[PDB]
Design an enzyme around this catalytic site. Structure first.
Site, PDB file in Angstrom:
ATOM      1  N   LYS A   1       4.728   7.212  -6.426  1.00  0.00           N
ATOM      2  CA  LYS A   1       5.283   7.547  -5.130  1.00  0.00           C
ATOM      3  C   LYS A   1       5.431   6.294  -4.288  1.00  0.00           C
ATOM      4  CE  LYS A   1       3.919  11.300  -2.932  1.00  0.00           C
ATOM      5  NZ  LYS A   1       5.208  11.855  -2.492  1.00  0.00           N
TER       6      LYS A   1
ATOM      7  N   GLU B   1       0.834  -1.200   0.000  1.00  0.00           N
ATOM      8  CA  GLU B   1       0.000   0.000   0.000  1.00  0.00           C
ATOM      9  C   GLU B   1       0.874   1.257   0.000  1.00  0.00           C
ATOM     10  OE1 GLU B   1      -3.031   0.002   2.987  1.00  0.00           O
ATOM     11  OE2 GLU B   1      -4.107   1.717   2.144  1.00  0.00           O
ATOM     12  N   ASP B   2       1.567   1.415  -1.136  1.00  0.00           N
ATOM     13  CA  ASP B   2       2.322   2.617  -1.491  1.00  0.00           C
ATOM     14  C   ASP B   2       3.497   2.806  -0.537  1.00  0.00           C
ATOM     15  OD1 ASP B   2       1.941   4.970  -3.544  1.00  0.00           O
ATOM     16  OD2 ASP B   2       2.506   5.966  -1.669  1.00  0.00           O
ATOM     17  N   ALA B   3       4.231   1.722  -0.296  1.00  0.00           N
ATOM     18  CA  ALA B   3       5.393   1.739   0.580  1.00  0.00           C
ATOM     19  C   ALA B   3       6.458   0.822   0.007  1.00  0.00           C
ATOM     20  CB  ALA B   3       5.046   1.323   2.005  1.00  0.00           C
TER      21      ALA B   3
END
Ligand code: ZN
Ligand code: ZN
Ligand code: ZN
Lengths: 118, 78, 347, 98, 48, 632, 159, 252
Positions: H196, H60-62
């Site tokens: 990102k 989750e975006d990490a």
């Protein structure tokens, strides 16, 4: 990181100056059914104070504790006096928030008196 | 004449196991044989299993009527 | 206000004027005893006669006197002479007041607790102040000596047995109950009562059992028959536990082993008979070979010493502390040197 | 939509459920006589559906360990509230269309 | 007085002199009191 | 010990009388200078020390206490001339636009005033079956015989309103139902909006003294054949209430006893003194300068009244050039300026003109920057931290990773028992910088100890005197409590905005992860909080007292908040890697051997108190093999 | 010296000694460490209450018997462990009224003070002259015009 | 992007200049990057990115950064706070005689500030350190002001500014301060394909999945950032930069 413990109290509403609980989170805690977590975070952590009420009337700005006598603790009394009634009896203590004692003392500027049934 | 729920709801269990855990703490007399734990909630939750909590509950009806249930009487769910 | 001007001045005519000023609507005597108590820091004997006349003029002032004793204590940072003169005057007050002795004793024992815990057997001025105050109170106990023993038992059970890792406050009870066999016998009865009662917490029971072992193993005025009877009661309680079945069991086993190690000669009669005292070797055979294994929780030096003695004769913070022989060498010499028994466990 | 939810919150803050199972306000005012017309909760109604009844006919004994009290006393006495379901299912054989 | 227009619902409750008996959850946290919610819907007793 | 047990069971508010506040006040101000030039608070001024203290180091000169022990004392600003009451000015105008000067009565028809008097004494009991029965019998008694000669009462209305009030009297407290207050606010609103309009006087049969109002500061009478002064308004309205107190006090259920038999006076519509709020409730201000403007205008009024009380000229009932009307020696404009400044004190919308205003008590109480939303219903709290959440998965779903920059500051007061001692012994030995747990302990009689972090003897000294009640009090009321650090079972209460539903606050067990400065959550939690890991920041509330931990285990826990209040679907699962890993492991092709099955099972479980029981091979020969379904 | 009951202090409800033996109910804020062993907490609180001024019982007590609680259910509050009770107790009280006769035991004599005792414990302050003469003066009975109750555990009478 | 802003760091007095120590040029880049000479001021660092769901802290975006590579200098930077101090625009009581100066024998500024009132150059400053001390010359009452910021800063250069003529008195100064600002957990990265990540866990190097060539990766990227975002361009850039670092080429 806004970690808070024994935070400084302001002048009006002496509560944390601090991290905000919030009016919308009250809603979720009431939705759980946890009245005591809510009583803790609102009453016990922020702005808890005692208040002295004349239980016959119910006013909060009506008591007046006298100064200590000039006998220098030779039968020092240190009692409370409802000067509305000049009687030094049934001045009981209650536990209300200090912002409520600001609401009572600011309706008192508006010539509005608030009875409390104790 | 008591016609309410025979069962102990979750809010009942919360207040009973909270007050009784403060009625284990504040150097209050513990009422079960234990092994040496140090958390008041585990004591107060092992006393609920052993029917030892003596609390009476005043279940207020909306009139102002109250029924007096004992914690011993109420069937707790597993 | 006239009493504050007159009472701040410090003989006989001033004493008569003091009596005239204190008869005089006795309400005004509330600041006067506090102003006298502020003058505690010769003249002290005149203060004693003055307090005798004031407190024997009316009977309500001894019942009024105790918050002044709570408040007007000179602080720990104050020097040796001030504390010594204050405790000397307070023990004199405890002499001429038969009713107020319990408040004085509990105040002195609480303050000596606070001076004992701050000085943890030297890893130093407060330790010397503790030495001076202990020697003064023990000289008082030697000069006086049942009601004193009753007060010390009450303040012991209220203050010192809940206090863990003590070093010097148990010495007062140790020198008090060594003067008479009955006092030490009643003290052992009270400790066995606190160890026997299951409604008491187990921490208090283990601290009492450590006090039982320390009193039975490091005393010279104790007879042998009382030690035999107390160890027999302890072993009977161990057998009551082992009939059907942990903490106070280990505390009682460590107390019995501690007494056996520090009394290795007195637990045997003669050279070698057909049976030793209370069948102690067979007792150790039936205790050590159990499945509970009490030797793990004990101090391993004590376990190794006990193993060496039983070979030659064929929780943990509550068990760590012991009453300490080393002290301050200024004033605790003439009390500790008479009735201390030699260490190192040489045989 | 902070405003809509704020208004519905402060007009339905008091409506707690009472020991007689009737939803009442903060002044005793009766809104409903059973909560939601059958008295149940929204979490605990998930497996009362007929597609999930074979989950509860298998796994039958796993549940009857927190639920021992329907083969012994003080419960499992339907005979006062089962006469109604013979009366209603008896009235609807003499009056088919209502 | 907490919802909206805190000066008119103050003014009517000063003219009409209204009571409330403090069973509303908004009201009983203006004053210090346990909400009659789940854990405020009874009080708690002990024999002896 | 020393704590209140007296609760509250009801509140009510009405107006002070002008005599009650005079002996609830202490000091009169009389000096329009709020601060001095030296720096001290002003002598006999507005931050006077005869009121509450203006700082935290000086004391009060009425009851000698400091800022921590007092609450301030009310003063009062004396007004030499009477102003209107800014709360009840509108209802005063409606009691003059529906009344007249010729006869001191009201121009409403008396066929309906008796009905409203007859119903609003029924609904004080709250019968409510007969608010239609009284108008039914009013209409029947008015159709069977028309009688305007019935002036005071009607016997057929009063028979019912003395029958259902004397009978059915025990329900005087069950009048708080919605159906009762709805009906009484409805009937009073129909009265003030339907039967209180300006009409030609039908009782005196003469001309009308018409009144009219402008900009909430000015009443003007007219001529039947002009600035209505508030002194003449007192002398007019007091006669109005002495004629109509039987009805104008059951509209205005006022000070006490519901205005029974002429109790509510004409003393609260008119003010000759402004009580100041206490000095500590207005910190060093926007509300002091309103009172200073009032007081400077009072100085101007006294300057005018000293010149209108001349023995040469006395017109009352330049040296002051700054007043407006320099022609006439009357100056009503100064007095309407004083009443406008009182309007500025109580509100800021009744003023439309004066630019030197700062907001009064309505703007302090009403909106979201007020009291009931900013300070009374949602409060800034203590014992709570705030930090950025980050992903984590090797802690439980009912778990939170907490840094050791929060577990050195977040403190829980634990009551010292002889049951949970020797754990708080270690947590005084450590000292407030080391975390197995540590302290900031408070003694028996109630002063903090403040154990220092630089020394060790002054911490073991406290760590040995813990369980002993070494105070010597006559009554043992309480024990020592140690301000313990947060440890690996404690509940923190976790908050993520916007708090729009019930699983948007949960109770997560703390777990003190070393060497970190972010909070950590498992992935199942970040759908109920609606979290996105990209800078989302949570509040970590920590319940101090002990009944805030019981619902935190049982009620607010993550474990039972698996479903959603909307329809009851699950809001907790496993998000991204795991739906691929379990779709590939539990496929038919996976075959582990014996050393790998036993590693996977013990990576799944972790230090469980119990023997790990195992299955058997799905394939026993030629090789012991375990299918991936057997691991699950 | 300790105040025992000893049959209402040897029945001093007699001449030149005015008192009343009536029941009194007080308020109990009990520490929760006495939920077994209940009676010693009640009499441990009340022993810190004796020999001074109070509100329910007016003047001063000297003794008490039959300390029982009204109602079997104690009032555990909302967020509280202090279980709350109310004790009825058969106190032995006495208070000076204007126009009564009390005890007297002389200590000394001065120009402006006669020190009289009340039941051997409480001190009564009496001026020695009645503004007539202060030269010749040889159980005392007197009159009370005001009462001066002290603060910390003692009591006085202005006679 | 924290990149290399400019070259003249000494004579510029911006509020915040985010400098990246050791920026590289991209091995795979379009032709417009050279037409405008963007290698004079480059913005980011190359990285050996593997697309693996190895850990579990990687969703989750990490993303996961090698800890050894972080400790060796991967995306180290700075940030240059610069405070323009005047003693008549901010501090203003009377007579305007406020020059920076010390009274001889002040315990507040002993060996922490220089003999003229300004701090030393190279001197580390922490919260609660003296920061400037100025001297009202009319009486002698030297004040002091303390460093009221959280982060640790190093005084870098101190420029003394007069007015526009050149006759102004010593009352303006502009202290420029370095703040180091390395990658901590919670600092955000990106690529050149709009994807990102947030830095979640600095994974120790021996735990990384090493390859068959000997290499550890440098950044681990989740395969669950792709199918909802459809950046095929990060796949071709990965093949393209791997094949450009293996040949000495720069690919179009
Ligand atoms: Zn009153
Ligand atoms: Zn005051
Ligand atoms: Zn008229």
């Amino acid at each position: 990181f806004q970690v808070r413990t024994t935070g400084a109290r302001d002048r009006v509403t002496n509560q944390p100056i601090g991290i905000r609980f919030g009016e919308m989170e009250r809603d979720a805690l009431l939705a759980h059914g946890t009245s005591f977590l809510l009583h803790d975070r609102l009453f016990n952590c922020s702005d808890r104070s005692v208040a002295h009420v004349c239980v016959k009337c119910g006013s909060l700005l009506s008591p007046l504790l006298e100064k200590p006598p000039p006998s220098w603790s030779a039968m020092r009394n240190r009692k409370y006096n409802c000067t509305l009634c000049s009687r030094s009896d049934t001045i009981d203590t209650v536990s209300v928030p200090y912002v409520f004692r600001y609401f009572v003392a600011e309706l008192a500027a508006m010539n509005i008196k608030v009875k409390l049934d104790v | 004449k008591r016609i309410t729920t025979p069962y102990m709801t979750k809010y009942e269990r919360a207040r009973v196991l909270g007050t009784r855990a403060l009625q284990i703490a504040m150097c209050a007399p513990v009422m079960v044989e234990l092994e040496g734990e140090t958390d008041p909630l585990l004591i107060a939750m092992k006393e609920l299993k052993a029917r030892k909590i003596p609390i009476i509950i005043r279940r207020y009806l909306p009139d102002g009527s109250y029924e007096d249930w004992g914690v011993d009487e109420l069937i707790i769910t597993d | 206000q006239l009493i504050s001007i007159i009472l701040r001045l410090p003989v006989e005519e001033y004493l008569a004027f003091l009596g005239n000023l204190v008869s005089a609507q006795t309400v005004f005597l509330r600041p006067c005893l506090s102003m006298i108590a502020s003058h505690f820091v010769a003249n002290f004997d005149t203060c004693h006669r003055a307090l005798q006349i004031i407190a024997r003029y009316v009977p309500s002032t001894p019942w009024f006197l105790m918050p002044i004793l709570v408040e007007k204590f000179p602080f720990v940072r104050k020097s040796e002479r001030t504390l010594e003169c204050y405790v000397h005057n307070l023990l004199r007050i405890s002499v001429y007041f038969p009713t107020l002795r319990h408040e004085i004793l509990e105040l002195i024992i609480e303050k000596l607790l606070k001076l004992d815990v701050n000085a943890s057997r030297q890893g130093h001025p407060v330790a010397e102040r503790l030495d001076i105050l202990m020697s003064l109170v023990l000289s008082y106990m030697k000069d006086v000596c049942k009601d004193l023993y009753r007060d010390l038992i009450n303040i012991f059970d209220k203050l010192l047995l809940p206090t863990h890792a003590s070093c010097h406050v148990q010495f007062f009870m140790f020198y008090l109950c060594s003067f008479k066999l009955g006092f030490a016998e009643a003290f052992l009865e009270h400790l066995w009562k606190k160890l026997q009662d299951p409604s008491n917490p187990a921490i208090i029971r283990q601290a009492a059992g450590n006090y039982i072992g320390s009193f039975l193993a490091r005393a010279k005025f104790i007879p042998l028959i009382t030690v035999k009877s107390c160890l027999d009661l302890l072993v009977n309680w161990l057998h009551i536990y082992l009939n059907n079945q942990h903490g106070p069991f280990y505390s009682a086993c460590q107390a019995v082993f501690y007494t056996f190690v520090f009394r290795h000669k007195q637990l045997l009669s003669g050279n070698l008979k057909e049976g030793l005292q209370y069948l102690q070797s067979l007792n150790f055979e039936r205790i050590v070979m159990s499945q509970l294994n009490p030797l793990k929780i004990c101090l391993p030096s004590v376990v190794n010493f006990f193993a060496a003695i039983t070979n030659k004769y064929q929780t943990n913070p509550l068990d760590t502390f012991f009453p300490f022989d080393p002290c301050v060498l200024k004033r605790s010499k003439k009390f500790i040197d008479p009735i201390y028994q030699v260490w190192e466990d040489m045989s | 939509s902070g405003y809509l939810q704020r208004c519905i919150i402060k007009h339905l803050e008091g409506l707690v459920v009472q020991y007689d199972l009737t939803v009442r306000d903060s002044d005793g005012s009766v809104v409903q006589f059973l909560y939601g017309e059958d008295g149940l909760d929204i979490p605990k109604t998930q497996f009362l559906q007929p597609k999930q009844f074979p989950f509860l006919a298998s796994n039958y004994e796993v549940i009857m360990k927190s639920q021992h009290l329907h083969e012994v006393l003080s419960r499992a006495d339907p005979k006062k509230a089962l006469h109604h379901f013979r009366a209603i299912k008896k009235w609807q054989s003499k009056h088919p269309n209502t | 007085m907490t919802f909206e227009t805190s000066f008119q619902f103050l003014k009517q409750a000063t003219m009409l002199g209204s009571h409330d008996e403090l069973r509303s959850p908004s009201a009983c946290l203006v004053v210090g009191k346990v909400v009659r919610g789940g854990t405020g819907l009874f009080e708690l007793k002990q024999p002896l | 010990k020393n704590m209140p047990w007296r609760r509250l069971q009801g509140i009510s508010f009405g107006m002070y009388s002008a005599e009650e506040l005079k002996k609830l006040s202490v000091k009169s101000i009389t000096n329009p200078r709020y601060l001095d030039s030296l720096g001290n608070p002003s002598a006999n001024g507005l931050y006077d020390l005869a009121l509450g203290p203006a700082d935290s180091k000086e004391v009060c000169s009425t009851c000698v206490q400091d800022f921590s022990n007092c609450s301030g004392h009310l003063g009062h600003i004396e007004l030499p001339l009477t102003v209107y009451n800014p709360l009840l000015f509108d209802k005063l105008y409606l009691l003059l636009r529906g009344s007249c000067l010729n006869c001191h009565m009201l121009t409403c028809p008396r066929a309906v005033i008796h009905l409203l008097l007859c119903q609003l004494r029924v609904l004080e009991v709250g019968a409510l079956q007969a608010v239609y029965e009284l108008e039914r019998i009013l209409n029947r008694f008015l159709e069977e015989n028309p009688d305007p000669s019935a002036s005071e009462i009607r016997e057929e209305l009063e028979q019912y309103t003395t029958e259902i009030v004397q009978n059915n009297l025990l329900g005087s407290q069950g009048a708080h139902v919605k159906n009762v207050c709805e009906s009484k606010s409805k009937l009073i609103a129909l009265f003030w909006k339907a039967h209180m309009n300006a009409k030609r006087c039908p009782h005196c049969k003469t001309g009308r003294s018409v009144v009219r109002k402008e900009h909430n500061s000015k009443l003007t009478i007219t001529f039947p054949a002009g600035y209505l002064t508030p002194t003449s308004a007192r002398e007019h309205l007091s006669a109005l209430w002495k004629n109509e107190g039987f009805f104008l006090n059951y509209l205005f259920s006022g000070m006490d006893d519901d205005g029974m038999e002429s109790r509510f006076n004409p003393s609260v519509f008119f003010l000759d003194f402004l009580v100041v709020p206490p000095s500590r409730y207005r910190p060093v201000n926007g509300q002091t300068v309103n009172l200073q403007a009032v007081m400077k205008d009072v100085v101007l009024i006294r300057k005018l009244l000293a010149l209108m009380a001349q023995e040469q000229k006395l017109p009352e009932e330049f040296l002051s050039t700054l007043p407006g009307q320099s022609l006439i020696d009357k100056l009503y404009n100064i007095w309407i300026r004083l009443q406008s400044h009182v309007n500025i004190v109580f509100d800021s919308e009744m003023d439309k003109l004066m630019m030197d205003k700062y907001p009064g008590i309505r703007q302090i109480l009403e909106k979201k920057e007020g009291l009931f939303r900013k300070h009374m219903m949602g409060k800034r709290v203590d014992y709570a931290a705030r930090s950025v959440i980050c992903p984590d998965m090797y802690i439980n779903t009912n778990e939170i990773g907490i840094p050791m920059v929060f577990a050195t500051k977040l403190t829980y007061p634990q009551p010292v028992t002889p049951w949970n001692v020797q754990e708080l012994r270690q947590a005084v030995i450590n000292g407030p910088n080391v975390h197995p747990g540590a302290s900031m302990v408070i003694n028996e009689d109630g002063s903090r100890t403040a154990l220092s972090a630089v020394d060790m003897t002054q911490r073991e000294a406290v760590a040995k005197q813990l369980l002993t009640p070494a105070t010597g009090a006559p009554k043992p009321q309480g024990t020592k409590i140690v301000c313990r650090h947060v440890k690996n079972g404690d509940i923190l209460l976790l908050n993520r905005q916007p708090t729009l539903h019930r699983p948007s606050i949960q109770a997560h067990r703390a777990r003190i992860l070393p060497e970190e400065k972010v909070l950590r959550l498992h992935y199942a939690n970040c759908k109920a909080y609606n979290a996105d890991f990209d800078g989302d920041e949570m509040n970590a509330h920590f319940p101090q007292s002990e009944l805030g931990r019981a619902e935190a285990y049982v009620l607010a826990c993550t474990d039972q908040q698996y479903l959603v209040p909307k329809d009851g679907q699950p809001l907790a699962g496993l998000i991204q890697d795991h739906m691929v890993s379990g779709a590939s492991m539990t496929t038919r092709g996976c075959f582990f051997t014996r050393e790998h099955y036993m590693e996977l099972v013990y990576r799944g479980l972790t230090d469980k108190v119990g023997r790990v029981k195992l299955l058997s091979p799905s394939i026993l020969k030629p090789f012991p093999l375990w299918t991936g379904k057997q691991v699950v | 010296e300790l105040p025992t009951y000893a049959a209402a202090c040897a029945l001093v409800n007699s001449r030149y000694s005015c008192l009343v033996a009536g029941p009194h109910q007080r308020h109990i804020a009990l520490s929760p460490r006495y939920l077994n062993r209940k009676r010693t907490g009640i009499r441990e609180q009340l022993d810190a209450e004796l020999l001074r001024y109070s509100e329910s019982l007016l003047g001063v007590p000297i003794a008490y018997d039959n300390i029982k609680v009204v109602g079997e259910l104690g009032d555990i509050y909302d967020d509280q462990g202090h279980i709350h009770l109310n004790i009825e107790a058969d106190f032995v009280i006495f208070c000076p009224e204007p126009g009564q006769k009390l005890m007297g035991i002389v200590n000394k004599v001065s120009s402006s003070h006669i020190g009289c005792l009340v039941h051997g414990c409480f001190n009564a302050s009496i001026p020695k002259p009645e503004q007539l003469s202060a030269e010749q003066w040889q159980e005392l009975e007197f009159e009370v015009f005001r009462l001066d109750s002290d603060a910390a555990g003692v009591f006085c009478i202005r006679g | 992007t924290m990149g290399f802003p400019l070259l003249t760091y000494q004579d510029r007095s911006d509020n915040k200049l985010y400098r990246l120590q050791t920026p590289q040029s991209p091995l795979v880049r379009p032709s417009m990057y050279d037409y405008y000479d963007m290698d004079n001021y480059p913005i980011g660092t190359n990285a050996i990115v593997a697309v693996i769901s190895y850990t579990g802290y990687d969703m989750e975006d990490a993303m996961i950064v090698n800890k050894a590579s972080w400790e060796r200098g991967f995306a180290h930077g700075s940030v240059y706070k610069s405070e323009f101090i005047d003693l008549s625009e901010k501090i203003k009581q009377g007579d305007s005689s406020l020059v920076f100066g010390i009274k001889p024998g002040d315990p507040r500024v002993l060996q922490k500030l220089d003999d003229d009132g300004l701090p030393f150059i190279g001197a580390k400053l922490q919260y609660g350190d003296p920061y400037y001390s100025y001297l009202n010359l009319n009486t002698g009452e030297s004040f002091v002001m303390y460093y009221k910021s959280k982060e640790n800063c190093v005084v870098d250069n101190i420029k003394v500014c007069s007015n526009d003529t050149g006759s102004g008195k010593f009352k303006c100064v502009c202290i420029t301060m370095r703040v180091p600002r390395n990658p901590t957990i919670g600092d955000k990265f990106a690529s050149r394909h709009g994807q990102k990540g947030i830095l979640s866990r600095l994974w120790p190097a021996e735990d990384m999945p090493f390859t068959e060539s000997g290499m550890v990766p440098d950044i681990l990227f989740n395969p669950h950032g792709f199918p909802s975002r459809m950046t095929i361009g990060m796949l071709i850039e990965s093949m393209a930069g791997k094949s450009a670092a293996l040949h000495g080429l720069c690919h179009d």
